[PDB]
Structure formats: structure tokens, C-alpha cells
Amino acid sequence: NDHVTRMYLVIDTVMTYTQGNVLSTVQNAFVERQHLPRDVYNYLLPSLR
Amino acid sequence: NNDDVIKASNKYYLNNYLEQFGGNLVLFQSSADLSKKFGTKKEPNLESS
């Protein structure tokens, strides 16, 4: 109508729920392609090489 | 011996053991028999073995 224009939405879960260090709380979950901190990166360097 | 295995990315040698035999007697194969007298310098003498 001239006075209303409908819009649909899809919830953006990543922005809503994953902010902060919440993901770090996950326990016993398979991980892949995660950026590594310096300590472990140096520790794991031969494995990546 | 089953086939259920996951490839190991990094492998390096851990222990090395060496077993050796120091003594080395010199063997000698000779068709001519040294027990028999050799001929003089000008005239030789051989009798096989």
C-alpha cells in the first residue's frame, strides 16, 4: 500500500549470540581451521609445516 | 593389523641403537699353497692348493 511496505527478516545469529568470548566456552567439540594464538602456534609450528 | 588408522602428520626418529663387530680379521684366498716351498727368485715353483 502507499502507506506501508512489508519487509521480511532472517535473524543474524552470528552477530546476535556469538559476540565476545562465548564460543570459547564450548567443550569437547571438533574444531577446524581455527586461528591460533602465539604460544600454541609456536608449539604447533612443526605440525603445520 | 586392522585398517582403521588416521595418518600422522609429524613423525621423527626418537631412539637409535647400534650393533657392531669391531674385530676384523683379514681373510686371504690363494690358489697357490704357501705350505709348499716357493721357487727361488729366478726359477719359480707352484703346486696349486
TrEMBL record, chain B:
This is Major tail protein. It comes from Staphylococcus phage Andhra.
